[PDB]
């Protein structure tokens with residue numbers, strides 16, 4: 166069946182301890198060491214606060230989890246511990262719990278984030294090259310360490326724009342990649358779901374995060390967020406098919422021997438491919454170079470095996486000034 170084209174044996178070669186997250190025994194820290202200062206975020210699975218570490222008076226972020234199954238939380242914890250220290254991965258600093266209720270908190274490094282809806286309009290052409298390159302560092306790293314993030318989107322990319330610092334967060338949906346394993350397709354967030362999730366191809370791989378990144382990147386260069394704006398999962402595939410065209414979708418489905426639900430097939434219809442330049446207009450013109458569009462094109466492919474890997478993406482000429490700058 167389908168397999169990743171890179172990093173496919175990472176968890177085969179590492180000790181079982183690295184990936185066997187249910188075997189983790191969590192070493193709980195002192196709940197009292199971290200005080201909540203104010204709320205900064207939330208989602209279906211947590212409430213997030215800026216905090217202080219009372220030992221050293223340093224800022225931190227406190228993610229207070231909503232009731233969660235042991236298996237699920239050990240997965241997030243072990244993935245964070247495995248990736249701690251890697252480029253642009255949020256650092257997990259401690260893990261603590263309330264004694265009475267046993268409510269767990271993950272403690273992270275602090276970032277002064279500006280939400281994307283307010284930050285991304287202010288980014289220059291070069292700023293988008295720079296921040297996407299920094300995000301790619303994180304994704305090549307996690308994929309190289311045998312992990313798929315499975316929820317890449319702007320809400321999970323913290324940026325302190327004054328310091329030009331980026332951290333990829335919220336590993337709640339991340340998993341370890343094992344060849345031929347069939348994963349749950351109910352991952353990512355709708356506007357960023359790959360076609361493989363939307364047609365029920367379960368033997369997907371790191372390439373799923375490259376689709377999500379392409380969706381984010383198309384929203385930034387075209388100033389059209391979200392770029393594929395579906396209402397439900399079926400409509401999400403329709404929004405894609407109206408852009409990339411149904412010919413390529415049919416080639417993909419035939420390659421992997423997938424049949425669409427008859428309902429879905431009828432909704433998707435038949436559509437011509439819409440060239441990327443048709444998305445160009447006066448709000449976005451300052452961002453839409455031929456290098457940007459080439460790079461985007463090589464991420465947004467139906468066939469997950471055709472997409473650029475994160476390592477290839479980093480070497481695309483679109484980023485050549487960011488690389489030159491970073492050589493020093």
Ligand SMILES: O=c1[nH]c(CN2CC[C@H](O)C2)nc2c1oc1ccc(Br)cc12
Nearest residue numbers: 206207208213226273276320321334335
């Ligand atoms: O692991 C997290 N999760 C969330 C909450 N989620 C759900 C909303 C968004 O998708 C993200 N925030 C943070 C998480 O880690 C953080 C580290 C620093 C900062 Br600043 C914020 C966070």
